[PDB]
Write an enzyme that holds these catalytic residues in place. Structure first.
Site, PDB file in Angstrom:
ATOM      1  N   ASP A   1     -10.912  13.155 -12.555  1.00  0.00           N
ATOM      2  CA  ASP A   1      -9.990  13.704 -13.247  1.00  0.00           C
ATOM      3  C   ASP A   1      -8.786  12.496 -13.576  1.00  0.00           C
ATOM      4  OD1 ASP A   1      -8.318  15.554 -14.577  1.00  0.00           O
ATOM      5  OD2 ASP A   1      -7.018  15.944 -12.792  1.00  0.00           O
TER       6      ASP A   1
ATOM      7  N   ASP B   1      -3.402  12.335  -7.618  1.00  0.00           N
ATOM      8  CA  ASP B   1      -4.451  13.351  -7.375  1.00  0.00           C
ATOM      9  C   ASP B   1      -3.828  14.728  -7.746  1.00  0.00           C
ATOM     10  OD1 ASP B   1      -7.041  14.096  -6.924  1.00  0.00           O
ATOM     11  OD2 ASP B   1      -6.536  14.389  -4.722  1.00  0.00           O
TER      12      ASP B   1
ATOM     13  N   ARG C   1      -2.408  11.025 -18.545  1.00  0.00           N
ATOM     14  CA  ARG C   1      -1.357  11.983 -18.009  1.00  0.00           C
ATOM     15  C   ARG C   1      -1.517  12.130 -16.626  1.00  0.00           C
ATOM     16  NH1 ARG C   1      -2.236  17.917 -18.911  1.00  0.00           N
ATOM     17  NH2 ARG C   1      -1.964  17.259 -20.960  1.00  0.00           N
ATOM     18  N   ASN C   2      -2.582  11.588 -15.963  1.00  0.00           N
ATOM     19  CA  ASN C   2      -2.638  11.497 -14.792  1.00  0.00           C
ATOM     20  C   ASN C   2      -2.528  10.383 -13.791  1.00  0.00           C
ATOM     21  OD1 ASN C   2      -3.615  14.186 -14.443  1.00  0.00           O
ATOM     22  ND2 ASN C   2      -5.817  13.617 -14.982  1.00  0.00           N
TER      23      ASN C   2
END
Lengths: 30, 290
Positions: B135, B153, B139-140
């Site tokens: 992922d 996470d 944005r993360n």
């Protein structure tokens, strides 16, 4: 030290191709 | 190391943004009556997690709760009841994607390049800890200070069994435009499926929070990639930088670069920013009483 693109007044294509680079085009194959 | 927490140690103050995969509150936690407060981020996941799903979120949090690297966001504590809850050191500047999007004008080429390194560093660590972040995206990634980014996470990482290299996600909702092709066609995720998202994510910062494959339905990213189309050269990008990304989007995944390599390259381009990244206007940027 400057091998930038050539884009007309900037804009960028949604995607750029690398075909027929077998390393990128995927043997569908069909 | 994994702190298992009492629903009454942290009080989730405000909602700080929320997807349909999860929802993130802020976010204050105080250990067992222990002194005072440390502001945390409460990620609560959503869709009904099976018994196998939970083992998985568990295993990874055992790892996530023990990270030593500076560029990966360490887990504080997890909070199982009927819902999961990850407790995170709160990051105030926040979602990096949304940072570059509105600090566009003042972002140097030195930052862009370090950020890439840091990320490549965080991501490298997570590889050495048998993880498969599943992922990674702009944005993360989070901003501690504008010169320090950490990978965060939200449960989707997967821990790798010593004698394995694969991983076969079940089903559901996936970030399709950041995924490799096996990932997309095969629900297979590995460390190289992970570098591919490193690709998209660095393209994502070079285009300054521009939207990937914009205008094109996820419905056949599958085929565009199958025909041989990838993400366009970003404008600020000399060929050198940009075909490092376009290395990460190769079909066969064993021969995409490795984060260990990816670290060197960007680390060298980093001690010489303007030679590779061209950004117009870069060099500037009770008691007392009446």
């Amino acid at each position: 030290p400057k091998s930038l693109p050539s884009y007309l007044n900037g804009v960028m294509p949604p995607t750029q191709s690398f075909a027929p680079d077998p390393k990128y085009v995927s043997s569908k194959a069909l | 190391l994994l702190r298992i927490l009492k629903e009454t140690e942290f009080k989730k103050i405000k909602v700080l943004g929320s997807g349909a995969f999860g929802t993130v509150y802020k976010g204050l936690w105080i250990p067992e009556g222990e002194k005072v407060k440390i502001p945390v981020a409460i990620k609560e996941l959503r869709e009904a997690t099976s018994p196998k799903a939970n083992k998985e979120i568990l295993d990874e949090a055992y790892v996530m709760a023990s990270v030593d690297n500076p560029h990966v966001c360490r887990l504080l504590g997890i909070c199982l009841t009927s819902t999961v809850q990850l407790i995170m050191q709160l990051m105030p500047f926040g979602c990096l994607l949304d940072y570059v999007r509105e600090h566009k004008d003042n972002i140097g080429s030195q930052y862009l390049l370090n950020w890439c390194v840091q990320i490549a560093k965080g991501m490298n660590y997570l590889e050495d800890r048998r993880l498969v972040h599943r992922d990674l995206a702009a944005r993360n990634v989070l901003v501690k200070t504008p010169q320090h980014v950490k990978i965060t996470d939200f449960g989707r990482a997967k821990l790798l069994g010593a004698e394995e290299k694969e991983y076969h996600a079940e089903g559901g909702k996936v970030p399709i435009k950041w995924m490799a092709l096996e990932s997309i066609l095969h629900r297979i995720y590995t460390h190289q499926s992970d570098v591919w998202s490193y690709g998209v994510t660095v393209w994502e910062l070079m285009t300054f929070g521009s939207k990937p494959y914009d205008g094109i339905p996820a419905s056949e990213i599958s085929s565009i990639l199958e025909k041989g189309e990838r993400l366009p050269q970003p404008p600020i990008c000399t060929i050198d930088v940009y075909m490092i990304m376009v290395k990460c989007w190769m079909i066969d995944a064993d021969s995409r670069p490795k984060f260990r390599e990816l670290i060197i390259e960007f680390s060298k381009m980093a001690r010489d920013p303007q030679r590779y990244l061209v950004i117009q206007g870069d060099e500037r940027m009770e008691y007392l009483i009446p």
